[PDB]
């Protein structure tokens, strides 16, 4: 059963990164690289979810979901 490493794409990106610090290295390769810096991530990243952010960054959600699954995560909060 899935228990750990769950990522909700519908909550603010900062909340994701706080819960999963290791996921930041993945996200910066998926159009979220300004959020590498804590100050940026805790400003813009508190307003934008992965779903919202992907539309702004022009990264297709399928690319994000595939990448996250390939690195051990289970994704929730999809449309």
The run of helices and strands is EHHHHHE
Percent of sequence in beta strands: 5-15%
Query: How many domains make up the 3D coordinates?
Result: 1
**What radius of gyration results from the CA coordinates?**
11 Å
Identify the strand order in the major beta sheet. Answer: 1-2
Description:
The PDB classes it as structural genomics, unknown function. Keywords: Structural genomics, Streptococcus pneumoniae, PSI, Protein Structure Initiative, Midwest Center for Structural Genomics, mcsg, unknown function. The assembly is monomeric. The entry is titled "The crystal structure of the conserved domain protein from Streptococcus pneumoniae TIGR4". The protein: conserved domain protein. The organism is Streptococcus pneumoniae. The protein has a two-stranded parallel ribbon with strand order 1-2. The protein is mainly α and 79 residues long. It has helices at 13-19, 24-27, 38-41, 50-57, 61-70; strands at 6-8, 74-76. The termini are far apart. It is built from five helices and two strands; from the N terminus they run βαααααβ. The protein has one domain (1-79): Orthogonal Bundle (SP0561-like). Helix content is 42%, strand content 8%.
Topology record:
Elements: E1 6-8, H1 13-19, H2 24-27, H3 38-41, H4 50-57, H5 61-70, E2 74-76
Parallel strand pairs: 1-2
What's the short story on this structure?
The protein is built from five helices and two strands, in the order βαααααβ. The chain is mainly α and 79 residues long.
Short descriptors:
79 residues, mainly alpha, SP0561-like, 5 helices, 8% strand, globular
């Amino acid at each position: 059963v899935v228990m750990d490493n769950i990522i909700d794409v519908s909550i603010p990106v900062a909340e994701v990164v706080d819960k999963h610090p290791e996921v930041l290295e993945i996200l910066v390769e998926l159009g979220f690289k300004p959020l590498a810096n804590p100050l940026m991530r805790n400003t813009v990243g508190r307003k934008v979810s992965l779903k919202q952010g992907s539309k702004l960054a022009g990264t297709p959600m399928d690319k994000i979901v595939r990448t996250l699954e390939a690195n051990g995560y289970e994704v929730i909060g999809l449309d």
